[PDB]
Amino acid sequence: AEVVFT
Amino acid sequence: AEVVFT
Amino acid sequence: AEVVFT
Amino acid sequence: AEVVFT
Amino acid sequence: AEVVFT
Amino acid sequence: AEVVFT
Amino acid sequence: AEVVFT
Amino acid sequence: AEVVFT
């Protein structure tokens, strides 16, 4: 699982 | 920007 | 921004 | 910026 | 910013 | 598990 | 899994 | 799975 908030 | 890989 | 998962 | 790898 | 996981 | 807040 | 950003 | 954006 990968979460990237930018 | 939101990326969610599950 | 928000993510919730299960 | 938030990165969460699980 | 916040993450909670289990 | 990797959390990176920047 | 990998993320790169700028 | 992959995403690239600019």
Residue numbers in the entry:
A (entry chain A), B (entry chain A), C (entry chain B), D (entry chain A), E (entry chain B), F (entry chain A), ...: 1 to 6
What do the authors of the reporting publication say about this deposited model?
Transthyretin (TTR)3 is a 55-kDa protein that aggregates into amyloid fibrils under pathological conditions. In its native tetrameric conformation, TTR transports retinol-binding protein and thyroxine (T4) in the blood and cerebrospinal fluid. Here we identify two segments of TTR that drive protein aggregation by self-association and formation of steric zipper spines of amyloid fibrils.
To better understand how 91AEVVFT96 self-associates to form fibrils, we determined the structure of the fibril-like crystals of 91AEVVFT96. We found that it forms a Class-7 steric zipper (Ref. 25 and Fig. 2D) in which the β-strands stack into antiparallel β-sheets with identical side chains on both faces. In addition, to further prove that β-strands F and H can participate in amyloid core formation of TTR fibrils, we determined the crystal structure of the steric zippers formed by the segments in isolation by x-ray crystallography. The crystal structure of 91AEVVFT96 revealed a Class-7 steric zipper with antiparallel β-strands and antiparallel sheets (Ref. 25 and Fig. 2D). The side chain organization explains why the residue replacements E92P and V94P hinder TTR aggregation because the proline substitution would decrease the shape complementarity between sheets in the steric zipper structure. In the isolated segment 91AEVVFT96, proline replacements in positions 92 and 94 completely prevented fibrillization.
